[model samples]
Target: MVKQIESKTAFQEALDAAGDKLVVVDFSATWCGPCKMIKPFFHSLSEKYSNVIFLEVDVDDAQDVAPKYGIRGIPTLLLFKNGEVAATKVGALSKGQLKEFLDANLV
Candidate 1:
């Protein structure tokens, strides 16, 4: 199962501990239509990309995290490497597109 980040503190801890690993965070909301649409794809990616750290954050639940990241959209994907933002995609993507995104960044 995909990891769910429950608090801002845990989010901080996770980010700090990620180190050289690829950290993928899904910034989403409960009431978001596209967020719900891409949920299963995200979960599947979490399973498929075993080497990457997958985390989900509900904007409403973890109020401070999103604003700090300047996330103004739902279903935004943030990819981190060496504890810094490597890439940011601001919309839901198809499975193929998601795979390509990972492949391109994982290089």
Candidate 2:
């Protein structure tokens, strides 16, 4: 399972590992209610799209990582393809929307 990134160095490695696949970077914080709420859905989809890399960056834990993506809001979902951002979404979402978005960009 893809777990939380704990440091800056790990974030760099994650960027490198995400090079060729569809990368979904989820930026969230521990105290935020919505952030905590979506954890299950995120895990479920990550497993559902096991072929792609679904990464979680906790704003409180991995402080440096969130700003690099210009994440202005909590629970920002950034989709990257071959290291370039392909799509972005903010706020909580349903499984269907998440699935549809991934389906649209899956290579």
Candidate 3:
């Protein structure tokens, strides 16, 4: 499951809470029109990758958190590990593509 973050501090805290675990963050526009095609797959990964923590930060709701991590667009995916960004995923996402992202980074 993904926790919706409200502030940058909360985001940092989530990463801290993760410690050594990989935290997959979904930064997206609050409108969620395009999100209809997404989110479900991200949740799937969250279920499959039990060790990873997933966070969702909608841009207007948590502006500070998005820019703090250089999120300039909607539906950007970031992989945070040990309180820092490990990798970022932008543009279109596929189940296979996202699975590869975790499979390659997940250890």
Candidate 4:
């Protein structure tokens, strides 16, 4: 299951505890059309990719988290490995594209 990041402190704690796993964080907003569209796919990915820890951070709820990561757009996928950011992609992506992204980064 995908965990929801409720605050900046929670996000930071997760980041610190990620260790060597691939942490996938979806930064989204409630009012965003694309964000809502891509949410199910993100959940699907969580079930599909057991090796990756999926997290969701609402840009509205956790106001500080998004800006800290320099998020300029909604539905940004932040990839982390070994407690450091590995990659970041903006916008909504299709299932195939998301799979391709995971495949490329997981290596």
Candidate 5:
């Protein structure tokens, strides 16, 4: 399963702990209307992609660096490779879209 973050410090900790591995982060909160698959889909993601580390940065607590990370919307997905930003995707997504996104980067 994916990991949940408490603050910006926790985010850095996750990246630091990731080392050379890719870190896939879901920048979002509990709920805001849509996307009921947060617990099931995203939780299922880590199971399928065991090679990389998954993190959930609740936007509410980590507002300190959300703007710095250039997050413009909820549920923005970011890829961190070797502890650096590799790619960014905005909005909620389906299974195929997520697969495509990860494929392009993981390759």
Candidate 6:
């Protein structure tokens, strides 16, 4: 199973845990409609990208991550490598779009 990091400290730990590989940090909020729409996609992608570290950060609950990454909206996708951001996409996306983005970036 993939790990879900809830805090900045845990986020850092998971970043290290992936051995500097690509990681996707999904910033979302429970009250957000778009955020809810993207949750299942992230869950499915987590399975597909099992080698990468996929984490969820609740914008409402996680105090540090959202603002630090300039997360202006919910359901923001931050692709990371070695703890640094590589790519980002905000809002809901189709499965094919998600696959394309991951295939091109996760490698």
In terms of TM-score, which candidate is strongest?
4
Cα error, residue 6 of model 6, in Å, equals 2.1
Q: Which stretches of candidate 5 lie over 4 Å from their true place?
A: none
Overlapping backbone residue pairs in candidate 5 total: 0
Best by lDDT: 4
Model 6, C-alpha of 105: deviation from truth (Å):
0.6
The window of 10 residues in a row where model 3 has the poorest summed lDDT is 29-38
- 1 or 3: which has the higher lDDT? 1
Which consecutive 10 residues in model 4 have the weakest lDDT in total? 12-21
- How high is each candidate's TM-score? 0.89, 0.88, 0.90, 0.91, 0.88, 0.88
- Tens digits of per-residue lDDT, candidate 4, 27-77, equal 887788998887888888888887888888998888997777788987888
TM-score of 2: 0.88
How well does candidate 2 score on lDDT at residue 68?
75
| lDDT per model vs. reference | 0.82, 0.81, 0.78, 0.84, 0.77, 0.77
lDDT of 3 by residue, 1-107 (tens): 67888887788777778889888777777576655466888877788888888777777678887767777776687888788788988765888987898788877
Evaluation by lDDT, superior candidate among 1 and 2: 1
Instruction: Give the distance in Å from residue 26's predicted Cα in candidate 6 to where it truly belongs.
Output: 1.0
Residue 64 Cα positional deviation in candidate 2, in Å, after optimal superposition: 1.4
- Two-way lDDT contest, 1 vs 4, winner: 4
The digit string of per-residue lDDT tens for model 1 on 48-90 reads: 9877778788888888887788988878988888878899999
| Stretches of model 3 off by over 4 angstroms after superposition | none
Candidate 4 regions exceeding 4 Å error are none
Quote model 6's TM-score: 0.88
TM-score of 4: 0.91
What is the clash count of model 3? 0
Please say which candidate is ahead in lDDT: 4 or 5. 4
